[PDB]
Amino acid sequence: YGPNQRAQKKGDIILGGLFPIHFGVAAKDQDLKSRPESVECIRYNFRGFRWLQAMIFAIEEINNSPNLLPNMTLGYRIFDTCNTVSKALEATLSFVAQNKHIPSTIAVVGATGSGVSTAVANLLGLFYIPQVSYASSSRLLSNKNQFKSFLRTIPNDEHQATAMADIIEYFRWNWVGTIAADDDYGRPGIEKFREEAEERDICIDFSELISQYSDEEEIQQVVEVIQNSTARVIVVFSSGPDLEPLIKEIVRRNITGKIWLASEAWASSSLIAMPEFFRVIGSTIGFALKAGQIPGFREFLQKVHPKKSANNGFAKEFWEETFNCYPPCTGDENITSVETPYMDFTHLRISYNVYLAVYSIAHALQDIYTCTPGKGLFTNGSCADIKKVEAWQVLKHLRHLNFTSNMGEQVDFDEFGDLVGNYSIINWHLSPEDGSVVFEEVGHYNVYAKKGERLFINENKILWSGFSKEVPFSNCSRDCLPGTRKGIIEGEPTCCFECVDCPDGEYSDETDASACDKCPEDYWSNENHTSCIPKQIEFLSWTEPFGIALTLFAVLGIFLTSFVLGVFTKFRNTPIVKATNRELSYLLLFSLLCCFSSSLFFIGEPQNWTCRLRQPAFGISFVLCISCILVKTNRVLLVFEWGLNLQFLLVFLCTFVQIVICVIWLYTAPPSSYRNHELEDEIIFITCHEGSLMALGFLIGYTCLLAAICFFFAFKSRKLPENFNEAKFITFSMLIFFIVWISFIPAYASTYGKFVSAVEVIAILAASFGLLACIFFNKVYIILFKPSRNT
Amino acid sequence: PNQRAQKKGDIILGGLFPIHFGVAAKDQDLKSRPESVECIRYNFRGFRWLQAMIFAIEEINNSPNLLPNMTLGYRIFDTCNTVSKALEATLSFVAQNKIDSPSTIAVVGATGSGVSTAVANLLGLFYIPQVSYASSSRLLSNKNQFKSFLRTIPNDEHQATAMADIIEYFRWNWVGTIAADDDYGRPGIEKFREEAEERDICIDFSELISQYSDEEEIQQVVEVIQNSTARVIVVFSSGPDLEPLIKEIVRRNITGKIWLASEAWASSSLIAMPEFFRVIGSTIGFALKAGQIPGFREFLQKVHPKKSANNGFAKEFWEETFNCYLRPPCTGDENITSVETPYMDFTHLRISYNVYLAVYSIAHALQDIYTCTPGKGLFTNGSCADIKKVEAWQVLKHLRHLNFTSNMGEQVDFDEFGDLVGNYSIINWHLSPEDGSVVFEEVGHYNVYAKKGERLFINENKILWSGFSKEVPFSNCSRDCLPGTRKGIIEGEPTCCFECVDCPDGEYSDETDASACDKCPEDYWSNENHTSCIPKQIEFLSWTEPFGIALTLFAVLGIFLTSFVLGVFTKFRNTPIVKATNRELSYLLLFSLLCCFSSSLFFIGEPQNWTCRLRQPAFGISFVLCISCILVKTNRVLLVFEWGLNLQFLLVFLCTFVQIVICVIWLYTAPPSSYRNHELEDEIIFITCHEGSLMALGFLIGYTCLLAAICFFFAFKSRKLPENFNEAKFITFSMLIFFIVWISFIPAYASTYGKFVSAVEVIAILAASFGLLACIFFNKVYIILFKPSRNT
């Protein structure tokens, strides 16, 4: 006969009912020293009584409506579960009694716990009795090979975990921790969320299991792992009662920084949503089912009364727990005078599910009632009769039930027995009028939209941590700027890293970089390694200061030469001292002009033409000068052996000699005008690699040797006062040549790009300038000075 | 139910065994009234288990001491591995208590964690002891919900720990998981995921299966298995819930993986088929420890459908064995020893022993109830119960405090969670050479009593991989990191597969699998392979360096030529033919020469502050002494304008002191610090001297240069006086050779790094001093050595 505290009402058809009027049982572990007696449940749940009242109201409204099942009455045998499996199981045993004078229940509306409903459906489905639950939302109840006769008016919990992952990815967090009740409601949900979050590149720090029967040390361990972690977001998948201990311990230890992502079961629970817990838990964003509309329901709630309720039996205990009677009292108080979750509501969510379940079973019964004997759902097109209806026929009609909810909706269960709905997203607020927690809706989750466009959050209503209004930071490692790259911290997950600076020559312009990048050759990483600047080129220029200085030297020397030439064009035909070979003087002139014009060849950017001509031009001009001054000595050789031409011979001999090696280059190895970077790694250089090193050595040795023999045979006659004793002048000029050449070679041999050209150019310009001076100064001075040359 | 094994007695036990493997797959669309479902495939192992229970019961009934005059009856049913059959059997068990709101006292068995949960939810309602023998889920240890559930099989958390330990023992880190979607696979796989993740082991994929998943789910699972690179696959499932996946695997011929079997299917007969074995090679599984039930086999060899009225399962057993009918009509004369079945083709009793132990434990609980004495009982006030009217909760209370010895001499004692622990044997699938059946050879042990870390013990010499090879296959996400490289993140992949990037020059990485390169200190530099750092190369001038030897030999030869000049003077000092000049001035000039020549040695070795800070003023004072003494070696014009030759020394003992002032200035303003420098080379260290006062170096050199220049100008104006071999041109050429020395010196020094700075200084000073000595002395020393004619 089941328990004695129950709600009961007769009728042709009887429906079952399991509601959590209490919260749990008295935890007295029977040591079995005596016969174990029937355990007792302890706490009270006004929400559960609201649900039971909703079911009773639905049945009464069905019995009152004249169209749905006329000339037939609905009865019920509603029991209490106290949220435990033992009570539900004894109740269901009282249900299926007559199967194998007692009424035979045809349908069961209840089992609000996914652990409770599992154990109930295991037993009901053995007799094929339809069980229409309203609040059990575990996914395991979708295995229609196990629970053959289980339907539910509440959506499955897959979309809830998907929505959790979507919310976490929307606020751009990647470091969370998960808590789930060690039950059939938290385990599968947390597993689904784990996979959905790992596929979205989200890292999970910790994962713990709790329950209302967990001892104190395990709660200590959980609080420790919560405190010892850096994750700010905590995804809780549990119900009110199985969460209350953890909340009490967290309030006692005063952990304040975290953010709670509430599941639907406890996001609106009065056990948790109280101010002293709110000050500590801070910000909670949770889900909620869609509201309902049961017109005329409040006026039914306001009529509950302990003496005017013979059918309902829990009304007495309700009166007691709400007024503390039997301190005996009157029984004529007002339910509106005290504030309890009973009528302190604005949106009916689970009560609407109970209403819908009762109405769906009534509609299946009507469907069986309005049959046509030819188009039935059973074998041979036959159909069943409502006077001897059995449970399996009602199950058959429920599988194919498809009707219209008074809100103008379409109600029809899937092939997995469940319905589907679109969630509201609420965020906990503190009412400035009362102090109580009030749930304000801030977002929506439409599950019909395509994957990726389902969530809609209105961010300006979310109140973060009570005061501030920017999204808190809950990443593992700080995201560091461009110029840096991620760096593995071994042991830690893929979301936690250090970041190391990029070396020079590599850059990174992106945030969250995986590796730095080498830029092309003529580019180089800048000072912040964020963008490569074209690598600086360097060479001798014209706007450059030293460029202008040597240009000044060259042009002034050429101007001196042009002055000498003009003067000689004025006074050519006077052999006063020009009795010597005037042609030899003019040839010295043009040779020195070519020398001074060889300057320009080392001023700009060296292309191949430039230096490929800058070696031979200097070569020929310099050997012309030195050979002219060589043969410009005494005619000893002439005495030993047409016109001046014979002397020309010697020069037009010796020049050609050098010229030979010259052409060698142009047909063995031109001086390559190329670049070089290895020497600086920051600034590029451009020079000319000499085509043949030993051949350049040969060239300079040839010209210098000739000048040396000139010095020898010049100072052997170094004491003859002819033409103002030019012997000392030629020796002085050649000593100038040798000093500049010697001061040139070593410093040159160890110079980098620009200064090789610089040194060579200054050496040549100085040598030729000194020659010009030391040879023409005395003569032009005595002509401009004392016009008397006869001896 | 109708078919059952029933025997009467004073005390009744219950049993639940999977005689069949499942029910006939047929979906009732409920067009007609549903009827009793039927079971399809036979299971000889379950029948051996049932026979073990019956054998234990009858043997206890035959013992004189254990339950001396009592009698044990039993009512054994079949679960068909489904929940509905078990639940209707249970409803048949609790009929006596159900009528409150043939009473059994205890039930032995569920065989399935789902069946166990569904049964214990109902049995714990009446406090009836349920002693399972194979239910190994961890959810049944929650004694707040399953009050009266005891099991004689170890829990399955140790199994997940053992699997993680095996994986990290064979050095794998890229694996994948498969689980049955029931109360046995899900908790085990979650526990293994935790245990692996804490050991830094990656899990590539994670799937769920069941015997009811249709072709598309299995195809998606096979796609996930194939499109991955993990070789090791852990499977937490039973035989039936795994058979479809195995069929699909053997059809698609996936033939590369390594299977880590859980206990349920490691020794299963549905999976251990020779045809499946070709593609499921290299199977490594767990097993319970063997038992000894003496006299069991002979009891098995007596089954017969006629002489078994208590047992009812014998008829269908014979029909399934001989494939007969009681199509060809059957006859009770066959030989159960002829056909080969999982019935009698066994070698170790592992789950039959658990049934034996469960029955014996219930018997010993009843015994403890029986040999109790008043005042020493366990119930209220020390009171004790009567065995002739024993109730279920009393046997439960006695079972919680049960402690006895097995037939093998072990201590059976249920933990406070109602489960006794045991070791694991580790088997590996082999192929029998004779017939061809799969043979399970024991290759390892797992002791749960040893401390964490030294529990597993594998014998590598017996494991054979893939049938032919004998080296452990490679199943890592990425190949290892060789020395010289470092790990590099791939943005999307997990932590355990990376890339290999090279360490830059200046950093090294000797360790394998290094997360970052290390920079060697100031003294060292990377190798070529960036493996270890080798010391740098400091570049300072040696004394054994070739150029060092050339220049020091130059110095010593010049110095001994100076000493030879001094010896020549010692021979012919008092012959003033030319020494009538200032002899003391000659000696002082010669001393200035020797000390100038010797100043070279102070720029040869490594610079301390002593050596360099004194090497500067040595050259300074020596060279200015030289230039001042030759300055005074000129004609006495100043002397004519203005007592004793000492007067000239005034000038020199003036001039030197002047510059020595500057000397002391640097000596205590910012002396030339002898320090290192690498910034300009990045490979080689230059140790040089930075002179803290550039203006003081300028002071010294410019002062000496201006002295020389003024003396040169004044000697130049008088460069044409042929008295005393016309030394005027000699001294002007002297100052000019010194000046070209200095002229070539300054740009070279200006345009060099460390080494050639000192090289240039030494070269220039040696050159100038050599030239001065030669030009000033060679003339007169030649006039004496060559021309013995000295009169004017």
Ligand SMILES: *[C@@H]1O[C@H](CO)[C@@H](O[C@@H]2O[C@H](CO)[C@@H](O)[C@H](O)[C@H]2NC(C)=O)[C@H](O)[C@H]1NC(C)=O
């Ligand atoms: C925490 O880490 C995540 C990445 O794991 C960051 O999310 C990125 O945010 C930027 C800016 O919107 C996007 O361009 C990226 O596409 C996001 N990454 C991914 C995978 O979507 C997040 O910004 C980090 N949190 C903070 C405060 O920076």
Ligand SMILES: *[C@@H]1O[C@H](CO)[C@@H](O[C@@H]2O[C@H](CO)[C@@H](O)[C@H](O)[C@H]2NC(C)=O)[C@H](O)[C@H]1NC(C)=O
């Ligand atoms: C799913 O959530 C969405 C959000 O409103 C609801 O879909 C809307 O319903 C109304 C009426 O059909 C339309 O005006 C809107 O255009 C719909 N939005 C979209 C994107 O289609 C819907 O009501 C929710 N699901 C249920 C069963 O109510």
Ligand SMILES: *[C@@H]1O[C@H](CO)[C@@H](O[C@@H]2O[C@H](CO)[C@@H](O)[C@H](O)[C@H]2NC(C)=O)[C@H](O)[C@H]1NC(C)=O
């Ligand atoms: C599990 O672990 C080992 C088996 O390897 C058993 O301990 C050994 O038992 C024998 C005899 O009992 C001793 O001689 C050894 O010294 C033991 N070895 C160690 C390391 O202790 C142990 O008995 C097994 N546990 C059970 C319940 O059988």
Ligand SMILES: *[C@@H]1O[C@H](CO)[C@@H](O[C@@H]2O[C@H](CO)[C@@H](O)[C@H](O)[C@H]2NC(C)=O)[C@H](O)[C@H]1NC(C)=O
């Ligand atoms: C696969 O990855 C694991 C992870 O390191 C490697 O395990 C290492 O193996 C060497 C050899 O014994 C050990 O010295 C290391 O200590 C191990 N690493 C860790 C963190 O324990 C394994 O070597 C890799 N597989 C192969 C074939 O290289």
Ligand SMILES: N[C@@H](Cc1c[nH]c2ccccc12)C(=O)O
């Ligand atoms: N889905 C929840 C049931 C539930 C929904 N809302 C609730 C509110 C309070 C308690 C329980 C619930 C479960 O599986 O347990």
Ligand SMILES: N[C@@H](Cc1c[nH]c2ccccc12)C(=O)O
């Ligand atoms: N332990 C498994 C059942 C099991 C163990 N060993 C077995 C051998 C054969 C069949 C089933 C089993 C479970 O929890 O369900």
Ligand SMILES: *[C@@H]1O[C@H](CO)[C@@H](O)[C@H](O)[C@H]1NC(C)=O
């Ligand atoms: C709890 O922690 C917060 C952190 O600031 C602090 O403000 C508050 O005073 C603490 N309250 C108690 C009771 O410890």
Ligand SMILES: *[C@@H]1O[C@H](CO)[C@@H](O)[C@H](O)[C@H]1NC(C)=O
């Ligand atoms: C309760 O008492 C009466 C009867 O219901 C009602 O009119 C009254 O408004 C209620 N009291 C309050 C404070 O609302």
Ligand SMILES: *[C@@H]1O[C@H](CO)[C@@H](O)[C@H](O)[C@H]1NC(C)=O
């Ligand atoms: C049944 O479903 C269809 C569409 O699915 C809809 O048109 C109809 O209104 C529903 N109800 C009935 C009674 O057909």
Ligand SMILES: *[C@@H]1O[C@H](CO)[C@@H](O)[C@H](O)[C@H]1NC(C)=O
């Ligand atoms: C199956 O896989 C194995 C290994 O690749 C190969 O030898 C064999 O040919 C394949 N096909 C069949 C039918 O076995």
Ligand SMILES: *[C@@H]1O[C@H](CO)[C@@H](O)[C@H](O)[C@H]1NC(C)=O
């Ligand atoms: C047949 O039964 C008996 C056993 O007593 C014996 O002849 C023999 O063992 C059996 N046959 C075979 C092949 O074992």
Ligand SMILES: *[C@@H]1O[C@H](CO)[C@@H](O)[C@H](O)[C@H]1NC(C)=O
């Ligand atoms: C259990 O039995 C053994 C053998 O009598 C004994 O050693 C032990 O003390 C007993 N009690 C416990 C708690 O093990």
Ligand SMILES: [Ca+2]
């Ligand atoms: Ca309930």
Ligand SMILES: [Ca+2]
């Ligand atoms: Ca609640």
Ligand SMILES: [Ca+2]
């Ligand atoms: Ca780790």
Ligand SMILES: [Ca+2]
């Ligand atoms: Ca079973």
